[PDB]
Design an enzyme around this catalytic site. Structure first.
Site, mmCIF file in Angstrom:
data_model
loop_
_atom_site.group_PDB
_atom_site.id
_atom_site.type_symbol
_atom_site.label_atom_id
_atom_site.label_comp_id
_atom_site.label_asym_id
_atom_site.label_seq_id
_atom_site.Cartn_x
_atom_site.Cartn_y
_atom_site.Cartn_z
ATOM 1 N N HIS A 93 88.255 83.318 4.201
ATOM 2 C CA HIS A 93 89.436 82.484 4.475
ATOM 3 C C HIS A 93 90.708 83.076 3.877
ATOM 4 C CE1 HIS A 93 91.673 78.521 4.739
ATOM 5 N NE2 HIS A 93 92.272 79.038 3.680
ATOM 6 N N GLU A 94 90.660 83.429 2.593
ATOM 7 C CA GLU A 94 91.829 83.986 1.908
ATOM 8 C C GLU A 94 92.262 85.304 2.560
ATOM 9 O OE1 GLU A 94 93.615 82.594 -0.390
ATOM 10 O OE2 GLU A 94 92.373 81.218 -1.599
#
Ligand SMILES: COc1ccc(S(=O)(=O)N(Cc2ccc3c(c2)OCO3)[C@H](Cc2cccs2)C(=O)NO)cc1
Ligand SMILES: [Zn+2]
Ligand SMILES: [Zn+2]
Length: 201
Positions: A93-94
């Protein structure tokens, strides 16, 4: 919610990185797993930084807002990992933020797809739910992705676990679509990332 900003696309998909100290080997493996996952589904590549001006720095800090979305010009950008946000799916996600994605539920067209339940948002955290301004996002012809690794869960920043802040508006395959998966890149994430980075077919 792919950035509209051309300067924020990493040239040739090449993302230089540095892994900060204090990380265990186990944690470094997760970072590599997350980076290879992106590499194996898109033309994005991660390179150990030498002298590049722009690069990502895996930094060991308490979990929370905020990450730079896309390539920051003229200096490094932190990708922050803490005790309670170090798992594969969260790092994937990051890295989604790094490559140029905002949160899916902030797409300019999101009101067709989800309802935001304002009364259940933690006071002071309402900015998490503000739509990106229409000029800040170019979705590249891709539909709203409930399965996106970049989509919040039903109760993210809620006043309580059983109170929803986000409710999908309609049924898909007979039910309201599940949101907030952190298992892997969705089919939508991959298709859209490939468009953003103009990846060879
Ligand atoms: C506007 O920009 C930001 C950016 C980052 C954050 S955050 O606090 O770091 N966080 C919010 C989050 C927590 C739980 C979740 C969720 C989203 O979806 C599924 O469940 C996550 C990273 C974290 C995971 C667990 C604790 S913090 C995020 O969105 N990072 O980019 C908040 C706001
Ligand atoms: Zn995020
Ligand atoms: Zn998307």
């Amino acid at each position: 919610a792919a950035t509209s900003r051309p300067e924020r696309v990493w040239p040739d998909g090449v993302i230089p990185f540095v892994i900060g100290g204090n990380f265990t080997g186990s944690q470094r493996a997760v970072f590599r797993q997350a980076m290879r996952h992106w590499e194996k589904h898109t033309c994005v590549t991660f390179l150990e930084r030498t002298d590049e001006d722009s690069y990502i720095v895996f930094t060991y800090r308490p979990c929370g807002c905020c990450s730079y979305v896309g390539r920051r010009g003229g200096g490094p950008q932190a990708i922050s990992i803490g005790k309670n946000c170090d798992k594969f799916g969260i790092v994937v996600h990051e890295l989604g933020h790094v490559v140029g994605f905002w949160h899916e539920h902030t797409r300019p067209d999101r009101d067709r797809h989800v309802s935001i339940v304002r009364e259940n948002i933690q006071p002071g955290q309402e900015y998490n739910f503000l739509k990106m301004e229409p000029q800040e996002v170019e979705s590249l012809g891709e539909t709203y992705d409930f399965d996106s690794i970049m989509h919040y869960a039903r109760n993210t920043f809620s006043r309580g676990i059983f109170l929803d802040t986000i409710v999908p508006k309609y049924e898909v395959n007979g039910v309201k679509p599940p949101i907030g998966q952190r298992t892997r890149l969705s089919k939508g994430d991959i298709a859209q990332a490939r468009k953003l980075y103009k990846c060879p077919a």
